[PDB]
Amino acid sequence: KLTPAQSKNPAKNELYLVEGDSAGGSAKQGRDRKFQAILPLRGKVINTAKAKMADILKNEEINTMIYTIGAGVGADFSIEDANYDKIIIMTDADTDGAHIQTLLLTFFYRYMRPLVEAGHVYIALPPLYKMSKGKGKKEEVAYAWTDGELEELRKQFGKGATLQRYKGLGEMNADQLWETTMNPETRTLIRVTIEDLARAERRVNVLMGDKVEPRRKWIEDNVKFTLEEATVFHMSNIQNMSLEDIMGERFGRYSKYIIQDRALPDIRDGLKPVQRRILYSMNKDSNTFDKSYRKSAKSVGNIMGNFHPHGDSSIYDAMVRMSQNWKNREILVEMHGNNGSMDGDPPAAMRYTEARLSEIAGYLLQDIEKKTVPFAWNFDDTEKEPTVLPAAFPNLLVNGSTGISAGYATDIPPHNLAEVIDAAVYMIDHPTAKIDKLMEFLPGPDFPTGAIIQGRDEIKKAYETGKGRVVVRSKTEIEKLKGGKEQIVITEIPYEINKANLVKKIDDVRVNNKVAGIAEVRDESDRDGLRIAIELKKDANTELVLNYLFKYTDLQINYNFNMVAIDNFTPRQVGIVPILSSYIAHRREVILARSRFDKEKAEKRLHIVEGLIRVISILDEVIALIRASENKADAKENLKVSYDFTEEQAEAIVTLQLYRLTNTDVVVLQEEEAELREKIAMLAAIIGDERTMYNLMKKELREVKKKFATPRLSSLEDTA
Amino acid sequence: KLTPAQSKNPAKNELYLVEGDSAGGSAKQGRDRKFQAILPLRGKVINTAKAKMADILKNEEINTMIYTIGAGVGADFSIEDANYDKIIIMTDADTDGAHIQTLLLTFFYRYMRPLVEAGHVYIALPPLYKMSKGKGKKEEVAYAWTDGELEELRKQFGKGATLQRYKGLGEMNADQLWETTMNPETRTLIRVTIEDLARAERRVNVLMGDKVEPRRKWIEDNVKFTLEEATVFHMSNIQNMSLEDIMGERFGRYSKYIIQDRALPDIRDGLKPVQRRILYSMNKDSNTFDKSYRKSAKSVGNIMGNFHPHGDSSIYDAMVRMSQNWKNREILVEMHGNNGSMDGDPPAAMRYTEARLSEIAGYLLQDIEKKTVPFAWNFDDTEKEPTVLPAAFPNLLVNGSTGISAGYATDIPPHNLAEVIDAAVYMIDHPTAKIDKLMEFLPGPDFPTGAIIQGRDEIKKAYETGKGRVVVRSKTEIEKLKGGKEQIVITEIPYEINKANLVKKIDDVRVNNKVAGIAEVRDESDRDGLRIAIELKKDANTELVLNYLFKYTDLQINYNFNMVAIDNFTPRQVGIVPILSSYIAHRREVILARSRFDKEKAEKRLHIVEGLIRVISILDEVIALIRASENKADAKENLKVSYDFTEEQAEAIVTLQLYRLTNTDVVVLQEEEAELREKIAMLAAIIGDERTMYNLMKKELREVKKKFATPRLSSLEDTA
DNA sequence: CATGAAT
DNA sequence: AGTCATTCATG
DNA sequence: CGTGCAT
DNA sequence: GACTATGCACG
Numbered sequence A, B: 001k002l003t004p005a006q007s008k009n010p011a012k013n014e015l016y017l018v019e020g021d022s023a024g025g026s027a028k029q030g031r032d033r034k035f036q037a038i039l040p041l042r043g044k045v046i047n048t049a050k051a052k053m054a055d056i057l058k059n060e061e062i063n064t065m066i067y068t069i070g071a072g073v074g075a076d077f078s079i080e081d082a083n084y085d086k087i088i089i090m091t092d093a094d095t096d097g098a099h100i101q102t103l104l105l106t107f108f109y110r111y112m113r114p115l116v117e118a119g120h121v122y123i124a125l126p127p128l129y130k131m132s133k134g135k136g137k138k139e140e141v142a143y144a145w146t147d148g149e150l151e152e153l154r155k156q157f158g159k160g161a162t163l164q165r166y167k168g169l170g171e172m173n174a175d176q177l178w179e180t181t182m183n184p185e186t187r188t189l190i191r192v193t194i195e196d197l198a199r200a201e202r203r204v205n206v207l208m209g210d211k212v213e214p215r216r217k218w219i220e221d222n223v224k225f226t227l228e229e230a231t232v233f234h235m236s237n238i239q240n241m242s243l244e245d246i247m248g249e250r251f252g253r254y255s256k257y258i259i260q261d262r263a264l265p266d267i268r269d270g271l272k273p274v275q276r277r278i279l280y281s282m283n284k285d286s287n288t289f290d291k292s293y294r295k296s297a298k299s300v301g302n303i304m305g306n307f308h309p310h311g312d313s314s315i316y317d318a319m320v321r322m323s324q325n326w327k328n329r330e331i332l333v334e335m336h337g338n339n340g341s342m343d344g345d346p347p348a349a350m351r352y353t354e355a356r357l358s359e360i361a362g363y364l365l366q367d368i369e370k371k372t373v374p375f376a377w378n379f380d381d382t383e384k385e386p387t388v389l390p391a392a393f394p395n396l397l398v399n400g401s402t403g404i405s406a407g408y409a410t411d412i413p414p415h416n417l418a419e420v421i422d423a424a425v426y427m428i429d430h431p432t433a434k435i436d437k438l439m440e441f442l443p444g445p446d447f448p449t450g451a452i453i454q455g456r457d458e459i460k461k462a463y464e465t466g467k468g469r470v471v472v473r474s475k476t477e478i479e480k481l482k483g484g485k486e487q488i489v490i491t492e493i494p495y496e497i498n499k500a501n502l503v504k505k506i507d508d509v510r511v512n513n514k515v516a517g518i519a520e521v522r523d524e525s526d527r528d529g530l531r532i533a534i535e536l537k538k539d540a541n542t543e544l545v546l547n548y549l550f551k552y553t554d555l556q557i558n559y560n561f562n563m564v565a566i567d568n569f570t571p572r573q574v575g576i577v578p579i580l581s582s583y584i585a586h587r588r589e590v591i592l593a594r595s596r597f598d599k600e601k602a603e604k605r606l607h608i609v610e611g612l613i614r615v616i617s618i619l620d621e622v623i624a625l626i627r628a629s630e631n632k633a634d635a636k637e638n639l640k641v642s643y644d645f646t647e648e649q650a651e652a653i654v655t656l657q658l659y660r661l662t663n664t665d666v667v668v669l670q671e672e673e674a675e676l677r678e679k680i681a682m683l684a685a686i687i688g689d690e691r692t693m694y695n696l697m698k699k700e701l702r703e704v705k706k707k708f709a710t711p712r713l714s715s716l717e718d719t720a
Numbered sequence C: 001c002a003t004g005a006a007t
Numbered sequence D: 001a002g003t004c005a006t007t008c009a010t011g
Numbered sequence E: 001c002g003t004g005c006a007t
Numbered sequence F: 001g002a003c004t005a006t007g008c009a010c011g
């Protein structure tokens, strides 16, 4: 891990703490090996304000930092044994970078404060952009750290130029990395000072302590979800910044991003950004259900390069999960090969597997081509991506979501498609509908793992408030055997539970003989179904055993609802009512936007058809006219002046291929006129009348339900 | 690793040896867990005929194989103690599958012979193809094992529904793996017998002993490089085959594949198949030098999805190598990021790096769009790929090639572009030119790492025969110091040598004081320069030290030429003359094919233009003609039949846009006729006259030389 | 012992 | 994101 | 713990 | 191609 400097010299030597090994390789290649040491970080550093102390000192990352600094730790910290004058934190300029800077600084504040206080801890600022007027002798190369140093740089030593947009240190090489962020002549750093020991203490504890509530509160008050962030103009050479304002600039940046753009679903389409990208990318590449499977590696690589600048494993894992019918109630990806099991064994690696969108996932994307949904630039401004999908079925409830953010988490269980549509259809007709009535249609969750759900009162509370605890209990049956004996047989288990770990834990009950009567525990499951068999001993009390298992193993668990999604850019704890009204409001924007799109298209076609019908009446004249003209533009002009065609009509006439003169059937063009007028009226009516629009919204939801509805799997029971 | 059956029963229990953990999972899912155990193989198994025995008995994979079978190791081998009645080798239906089958059967024949003799060792047989689709409720599934059975299977009173072509076990769901290869009632096996103890010991020692030359010789006589092999018409449940016939077909099929299709370069373009696929795929995706870099993962994924059905890592590694200017004399891929170093420190993973083709790589692909080169069906018959690139420069000698196959290896060093071209141009003019004259132009190799090459005679022998041993010696110089001291300074090192490992091995000489005089070894290399300093003690013998280091470290090495390439589908050991002559013959085919291509295109344009000019004269009749006609097709018919236009001409007229009738400038069309006629003459002359053709071949090679020539890097010296 | 496409 | 095994030919 | 997108 | 660490919130 550690690459040391050739020469000891505590007066000038530098320890580069580099985000990741790949970048650490770059830094090792680009350094001045005489006084610059490199310690790469294996990802996310332990939180030394949350974790215990058993853990802090068994952490390999932390120990080799202490070893190398060579000053001891904490209580016994000697500043002049330190082998470095500067400790330099050099991370990607992304938000996970800011999080890493955050976690280090908290370690140094707590266990190496003499070193922070004496201004020996810095942060390297790598460039966001590198401009290149390709060639121009060598390359004509300059760098830039703000939106504003970039605008400055559009002038300068050329125009019609290349602009690379840096997403990490890993995309930089040693000469680039040296010039811009490592060489003391040229580099810009920020030195970390303490301004108030009291104020900087309260900052570190609210952000990094195990108290969640103050953190969620800090985020509520400080983080502007709705607005941007001002560019923070770049200053030359070293500059000073409080531990207080660094920790809050960086952690706020992280928090906002992981809330809005990672771990939490959108309330409308129920997708995390990575899942939305998977679906969009795969659909744009025609990787649909109707067409052939396509190697996972190809899909993943296109997603990563076009939309999602992150690991191929994170993307592949997310893709695989969307194909697992014990995780998702209505799978969005079909995958050939080993996509895992309930025993949680590894899916085949992506070289092996192949994939495509499910039929139903087609319906989340339905009408995306008709400007139904806001798009934005991808990470490199090469390409647009949807911020939300059309969502012709209410995926959030149907498939649920489970995620862990900053200040917030979420748990939304899967639900029955038909039931969720039923509720939504009622609510379209009854905007003020209350829970009691909605639950006649949506009585509760419907896990793809089935089993028994207990706590009708608590479902109600979760559907009211977004929170509640419910009991999920495996489905069981007794069977008789040789010697009169019994065995408990398990056929459905609780959501999110590992079958093999459950079996093991039951077998440990047997072994430790916590309850009298267990003979043997066999998993007898196979490719066709789940079946765990708990063979009992001669005359053992079936009931006493079963009840011990439910109590003391995960044969029975509590599901805790915690229904948080993103609504108007803000995290938001929500019950069934805001969830369904948001969906409905969404489909309304979609159906109206789709209607406007198709209507504008029909109008243009109608104006042309009108034109073509007229041209046939004067075809001989139109052709002589075109022959008499000098060029295209002149022909169009003549057509307008002589015969009052529009620009649109004239352009269309003038670009007809000669063979089109073979079809001059005006009757057929008149049937098409009538059909277009009919259609424009229908579409106008939708845009003109909310109820006409809502009736369509319901018609479509019903079609979906008819096509994709499947029986409930989880049974419901009132008392818990 | 091992997943055991639930119930002991040496009568019918089965051990599945599956190729890969991913297929091992697939098998663990699809099994009958009562009697089928799963041992997954971590790829290529140790060769038991070659390895020591110290090394064999410490192989984790073998140890867990003898522990599980529970009988001991040949001699101590108690067949009556066996935990299984069938041992079933389950590998992919690819050539590396056949290789593993080969490697295990040597282990069993050699350390467990009673098992093989009793017919307790079986083979996988998984299906090559799967047929049909009725979609959600399908009743449309049928598996097939041969070419013959597929045609048979395409008949079915229904439609042409969809065909899947399996490439391994990774792509089969647990359901399909059971029905086809794991259920005893349905599956097909090969039982392995020893028909002749004598003939099966000759066959296993020829294929798997230390002796290469017998294996080479076996391959020469038995393996047909220019022919196919017509499938073994498939039988039912169990079938017997001798250990002699199995090892022979299995290893013959692997051997052939890795000679022709993996490890050995094509004599014309100098590329291994993976390199060609990288170049072609990247070029097809417009991932060229002139356009933006593009994420490596995206490149790799499309290579894997479209052309190369192998691991992402093997593809990235190959791709990365082509970017490294200390491995390739003229790099074929440009790569932003950590693409390694001379210290062999790992490159950034493909998630970080981004790449494109170099400019000169463009010259390998020059004129691929012009039917200059034979294409084949890719691996899943969905898309065509080139079997060889145009190669507008002689890449085989320029970038060389280093590979290991079966019976053969290759070692072709890099050469200087200008010099190879000079030799090639001379030989175009002098087909009979002999080595002494060619070496005036091409005196020897030019390593990208420079250094000093010693051995004119041996160069000559390599250039004559394909084989030769030369000395490659680091470039050194002696620098004076303070206080009566010298240091040796190394500035270039031998090709293929890891700088850090060399520095280490020199330092260990100091530490063990194997030779006296070394004060310190210091790698003083930076981003700009290679510089190693061996500082010597006051009054040490510097000649004695330097000579010790040359002899006993890699400060100097032997390079052994072993110039083997694929010539006409067969491996061939070749000197400079057959190498250069193959290149010139290839360029001839390319230039001729190109010229035909461009001429057919110019002739078509010309006929169309003749047609357009003629049309003017009959515009009114043409137009009237076109309105009368029933459709496009009919209109063309009348044009031909009435007016004696060709199909090409009629198609062009009938698709003119109406505004083209404004234009009556026959003169510009006539300038174009004339220019096309000139060009058709130039091109026909190239096709018609070998010297015209060869003179063009020379003109282009000189252009490439002028554009891309660089100075020699390695110096040459006559005395070893 | 290490080279480079493969498992 | 870095580790760890094997094949094959060769000196 | 173990969940699931990230480093 | 498997294996190992971390953050974040929540029972």
Ligand SMILES: Nc1nc(-n2cc(C(=O)O)c(=O)c3cc(F)c(N4CC(O)C4)c(Cl)c32)c(F)cc1F
Pocket: B019, B020, B021, B022, B041, B042, B043, B044, B311, B313, B314, C007, D004, D005, F001, F002
């Ligand atoms: N589990 C399995 N792995 C491999 N395999 C594949 C590698 C690759 O695709 O580039 C690789 O680099 C690799 C390195 C190894 F060090 C290695 N081993 C360490 C031991 O566990 C074996 C193995 Cl095995 C490796 C395989 F080809 C097949 C597998 F099932």
Ligand SMILES: Nc1nc(-n2cc(C(=O)O)c(=O)c3cc(F)c(N4CC(O)C4)c(Cl)c32)c(F)cc1F
Pocket: A019, A020, A021, A022, A041, A042, A043, A044, A311, A313, A314, D001, D002, E007, F004, F005
């Ligand atoms: N070297 C570095 N690795 C990681 N990293 C990335 C993983 C991924 O992309 O999916 C992963 O699955 C992963 C698992 C680990 F168990 C793990 N650790 C075991 C310890 O050595 C740390 C690390 Cl660190 C892991 C990183 F994100 C950044 C890295 F530099």
Ligand SMILES: [Cl-]
Pocket: none
């Ligand atoms: Cl039209």
Ligand SMILES: [Cl-]
Pocket: none
């Ligand atoms: Cl034209």
Ligand SMILES: [Mg+2]
Pocket: A092, A094, A096, A167, A168
């Ligand atoms: Mg990153």
Ligand SMILES: [Mg+2]
Pocket: A313, A314
């Ligand atoms: Mg991972």
Ligand SMILES: [Mg+2]
Pocket: A549, A550, A551, A552, A553, A554, A555, A556, A557
């Ligand atoms: Mg419990």
Ligand SMILES: [Mg+2]
Pocket: B092, B094, B096, B167, B168
């Ligand atoms: Mg394979």
Ligand SMILES: [Mg+2]
Pocket: B313, B314
């Ligand atoms: Mg590898």
Ligand SMILES: [Mg+2]
Pocket: B549, B550, B551, B552, B553, B554, B555, B556, B557
């Ligand atoms: Mg030597």
